Each structure stands twice: as C-alpha cells, then as structure tokens.
Amino acid sequence: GIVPVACSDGYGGLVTTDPKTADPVYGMVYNPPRTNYPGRFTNLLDVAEACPTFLCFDEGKPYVVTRTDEQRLLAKFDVSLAAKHMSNTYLSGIAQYYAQYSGTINLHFMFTGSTDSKARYMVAYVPPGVETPPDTPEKAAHCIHAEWDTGLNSKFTFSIPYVSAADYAYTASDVAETTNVQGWVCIYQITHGKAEQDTLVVSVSAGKDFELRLPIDPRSQ
Amino acid sequence: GIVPVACSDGYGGLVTTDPKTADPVYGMVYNPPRTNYPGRFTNLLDVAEACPTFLCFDEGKPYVVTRTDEQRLLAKFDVSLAAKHMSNTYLSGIAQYYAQYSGTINLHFMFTGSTDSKARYMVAYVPPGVETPPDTPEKAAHCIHAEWDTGLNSKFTFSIPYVSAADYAYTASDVAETTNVQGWVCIYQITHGKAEQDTLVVSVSAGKDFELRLPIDPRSQ
C-alpha cells in the first residue's frame, strides 16, 4: 500500500508573499565574483540614519530665512511622514511603504550666513491637544524645546520624540485623528544681528530607535 | 522516481472546528508588549465561581419579600440553567453554549433589612419524583435543607447538589424529562419579626466541581 494524504481545501493557492521557494530547473550556475563590491546597504534605515535629506519650505527651498530681527515663527510643520515639508525627503520615501512607525526623528539645522551675521533660534515639539501651534517663543517655551546660538559650529541636531497614546503611529494620514497626527514642530528665531539674507538649512534623518513596521504597496499603479 | 500517495476520498474538506492551522503569509510581526495587563481570565468558570449574579423573581426583582410573619413559600424555581429565575444570570449566560453539565450550583442569600428586623429562612432541594413542590416547611423538612437566622452576617450560601441518574444533565430543557429537569429549589420563611418591607436578595454562582461539557452554537442567528 501507499501513504494516504488529505489534499486540503483552502490551501495550495499562490500568495504573492508566501514563505516558500519554487522548484529549480537550471542547475550548476556559478556567478562572477563580487566580493567586497562597494557601497552595500542591508537595511534601509542604516541609510536613513546616516544620510539626512532636505525639508521643503515656501517655494521649495530647503531653508528658512527672515528679514526682520524680531521674534518670528520661521516655520511650522506637522509631525507626519506625510507632511508637505517632508515630501521630498528619503525618510518619507522609505516610509510610504510601511503602515506604521515609532521612534525618534532627527532634525538638522545648518546656518549658511556670513561671519558677520549672528542669530539665535529655537525649536519646539508641540504635542497634540492644543487647537493651534504657538505663534511665539514665549508660549512655546512651555513645551519640550531647544535654543541655540550661531557660532563656530554651523550645525545643530534635535530629536523629535515619539510621544503618543498607542505604541505605534500610522505613516499615512487621513483626517485629524489620534493615530495619524502627532503634533507639530515649530522653529522660531529669537532674534538676529545682520542676518537679513542669511539662511538656516533644515534636513531630517532617522533616530537610533526609529522603526518602520508593516510592508505595503499603496502607490497608484 | 517520487513518493506515491493516495489522495483519499472523504478527507480534505474544511471543518469549522478542525485542529489544524492555516498557511502563513505575512511574517516577522512583533506586537506591542501587553505584559501584566489586568483582569485577565482564562476559564469562564473561574469567573462564574467568583462573581455571583442575580436571580429574577416576580416583576423582575433580584429579591423576595413577604408582608406576613407566618410560614410562606417565598419562591420556588426549577433546577435548570434554562429556568426563568436564572435567565439573567451569568451562569446561564455561559451555559447556553454547552450541551451538558454536572456539579454544584451555589445560591447566595443576602438580607437587606434594618437592624430592628429579624427573620428565619429555609431553603430545600426537592429531587424529582414528587408531582408538585412542598408548599410548607414541614413537608419540605424531609428533604435536604438548611435553615438560618438573620444577624450580624447578612449572607448565607447553600449548595444545590448534583443528584441524578445519569452522570451529566442537559443544560437546555424540552418537556418534563429525566435528563433536563432535576427538581426544584424552595425558599421558605419560617417566620419574621418586623420585616414586612425587608428583602432577601438572591444570587447564584458555580460550585467547586461545576462543569460544562460540549460546545454548541444554538442561538438564532
């Protein structure tokens, strides 16, 4: 006699993401060597961590600038990988293919002004719960924030913290909801000296614990 | 050559309750931690044992009361999880999903009267075999019974014993038959003193050896 088997209903169909392998038909193929080929990356986030890309502000400029020396809200944007200001970044490029994330997102600020121009800036993380963002450094001071001088070192990095009710947040956005909008980031200029035409270039990268979760194919094809 | 197999007729179909698992298609998913989340229950009967729920008497009251100080049958009900008086209890809620049971069912009596009101009650288990239940404590005394005073302690618990010919009883009822009606429980007031408007709240829970047997889906859907 032979082995009895029950060909089971509901099993067997092809699933584009299944964990099995096909049957081979052309054996004994040896490839040209590619040992130590340069620039290899094995995880998208290793790249997203080390290579910050630029934010997009008014008229598509990767920077902000103000002609007045008074306090001003230079820019505000939503803490969403779906944000308009993030739309040209590599981080957002990667994130559109995952349903959820959690973790630190790092902002980088680089001053490009002349030796004779000085400024003092502030960056704040405004969590959800307030109707609109603070329009002044005074009101925003009560939030998690950092202030800095322009000097010998042109770059300043700040971590936007992951603070939410759920353990993960959606990468996409839909309408003002708790799972898809995690507050705002506000960048202010406290004041400046002779920096009317000088700019602050802003870029973003992934933090030490930034994480993307569930693979998706949502682009219109 | 390859392995010969006999795809067997009568096997393979899907059975809603089969003991196998489907084939996976989306791997590597790590969940948010939920260690030590509170109020977990792993067996329905752990809950049914610790949380008694109320019986339902005339006009849907979870209690009985009498205005006369004489002996009276305050209430009688069928020892059936299908009984009218049990219809709002959690025990009956659970039992409707199992074909059979066996074991102890516990009744709880709580006196709510004022300090100046006293009473003496009796509870009896009348097994099947008599045409109708005893209408008086005297006649019911010959059964398995308990009597008690109202005092410092407001609650009294009594176990309705499982006594039947078969080892299991049906949870549902059909018509007077040996497998679906296991007698009555009769609650009497022997007498009372100034307890005309005072009540005896009754609730029920599962006993140490209460057991429900065969899973069913009998509700109209």
Added chain:
Amino acid sequence: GIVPVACSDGYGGLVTTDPKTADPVYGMVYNPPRTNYPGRFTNLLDVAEACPTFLCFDEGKPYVVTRTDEQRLLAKFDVSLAAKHMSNTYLSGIAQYYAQYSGTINLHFMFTGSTDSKARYMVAYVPPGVETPPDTPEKAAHCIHAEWDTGLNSKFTFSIPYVSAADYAYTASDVAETTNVQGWVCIYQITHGKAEQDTLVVSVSAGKDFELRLPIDPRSQ
C-alpha cells in the same frame, strides 16, 4: 522547492472495511466512567462456548421422546451450521456471518424424566460417504459413537469431531457437496424402562478449537 508526489490512480477510494481512521473534529471529550461494568464479552466464541442453546426437533421441541422401549433412531440431523435443527441456536446465529469454520461442535443431552424412568442412549457421528444414515444402533456402532445410562447425573456432553478433506468447511450450504455437508449426527435410544412420556433435551455449544473465519454480510437487507 517542495516535495514531488505522484497521486496514484486506483488508490484513494473509500472501502467500507479499510484499516484507516477519519480526521477528528471535536476534541477534548471525557466520558463518564464505566469501569468494571458487568457482563462484558470480548469474543463471540467465549459466549458460544459457555452458553449452549437449544436444538429444534419435530414441532419445534428442544427435545426428543419415544413411547416405545425398542431401539429407535430418535433424531438425525446434518452436520451443518445451516441445518434445520440448528436454526434457532446461538452458534448458528453467529456462524451465518462467517464464510468458513473448523473445529469441535459440542452436543449436550439432558434427561428430564422422573426418578422411576430409565433409558440408555447412543449418539453417532456418521461421516460422508454413505448414501443414507444408519437406521439402527447396530449399523451405526461401527462409527465414532458414545453410549450412556440415565442416572444421578442428568447431562451428557459429546464432541462432534471436525473430520474433512479440506482444512476448513463452509458455514452455508448449497447442494450436496464436499465443502458444505460434513455428515450426520444420529441419536438412538438403545432401550428404556417406564420412560414413555419422558424427554431428552438437546443443546449445542462451540468446542475448545471451534473457529469461524471470514466475515460476511449475507442477510437480505
């Protein structure tokens, strides 16, 4: 790749007597205990050996009787489980479900006469080969036989031997053939004293080496 299999033609169909088991669908069922339930039997022949049942003679009597004190052939029957005289026995009840048998068949003779009635009987096994059975004890004496007195002990048991060309015999009969008729059993009365209305009750059971072979379902359904 995956395992290659050859779904074989000619295999897989359901066979009412196959040696396999179905797939389970309702697990975890514990039964009421039935330890030491009485009167269990595990082999039909244990019962057929210990419980003899009655033969059927003229007018359906489980006994033979003669009014004359002379030698007489009280009864003769075919050594067939299909015999008319065996038709109400448990042995024949069992045998109709098997195609073949072999072994000893035991006859039991019980005298029911009064203390004042005596008799002397003879039983003979006549193998095939003679046209008709011996009508007298004298002619039958040359066969395998036993003779006995009626006394204190009312019962006498005799073994009808299995003597045939083939190692097995058919339980059913068709027409006079070597595989389905194995001779006759003849019961004679040598003589008697005052036993005109007294009887000899006859019953049959299976012998130590009686055996039934091949399961069949031949009854008209």
Added chain:
Amino acid sequence: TTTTGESADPVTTTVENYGGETQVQRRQHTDVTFIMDRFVKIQNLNPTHVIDLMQTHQHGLVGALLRAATYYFSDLEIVVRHDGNLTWVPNGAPEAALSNTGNPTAYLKAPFTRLALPYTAPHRVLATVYNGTSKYAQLPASFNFGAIQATTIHELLVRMKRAELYCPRPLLAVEVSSQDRHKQKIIAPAK
C-alpha cells in the same frame, strides 16, 4: 456558610457542609483559548471589507463570548470565498493599497482561500467597548485586523488564535416568558 455579604469577597460553599462529597471536574471546554478557537461567520460583506471581529453575531458562540470581555488580543485565520484574486493589507494601510499585488495577494483556487494573519493593530490590546473618541457609539478605526478585497466576496469566516480575554462583561441567555423554564426541541431519535 455564613459571611458578611457586603464586602463582596467570593464565597464558594460545598456539598460537604451537609454530608456530601465534591466531585472531580474537567473544565477544558470552558477554557478561553480553546472555546474561541473555531471558525465563525461574518454577515455584512462587500468586495472591499475591513476585518472587524465586532462584525460577529452578538448571540453567536464566539460573538457573544467576545462581547463578554472588555479587552482582548489574538492572531487570526480567515476563510474567504471570492471571485478574482484576494488582497489583504495590514491595519493602517491606505484603502488604495488593496489594488496592488505587492501586498499579500492570493490567486483564486477553489473552493476558497484559508489564511493565517497576525494581529496588526498599533495598540497592546483591543476593546469591544470604548468610552470616548479617537478623532480630533462606534469603536476607533484602528480596532481592526486589516482589510481584504476581491472582485466579489461571497463568504467570510474568522477564527481567533491564541485568544486572551480581559475584564469580563455581562453575557445573556434568551429571556423567559413562561416563569418556569425555557423549553425547546432537544434532538431525539426519529420514529
């Protein structure tokens, strides 16, 4: 037993009190993981469907038991009878994604498709009742097991794997008019 009822401490009296003897109990059937581990129907279907265990019938074996808990967690198995190919996307995915093969897509194979899916919500556990809003009654949109889409979805069956229930809630039997019992036709041999 006599106790102070008001405290609400559990009291489990026994048959022994009046001379009886407690009898051994096997409770495998009432075990939560076991009892929830079976296929149950979902009724309101559409070619695009979001998997929501609250779609289970309120008086169904699983439907009612699930409702009788406040919080729960579990993995899942589904059986779908569909025309065309079936695509599933995880919790949080744009509805637009159901249109693409890159997401788990099962090519039609009679008579239907049976799959094993992981819990994908962003919460540690889910709820059957939620007193409040998720937007800046119904349950929050994030309480789901993803969505499926095919040309036509004829049948859906769901099965809860590794189920964990917390915080039990009321569970009801049918109400009884008679005042003695609820009677119904129990199965019995014909003739």
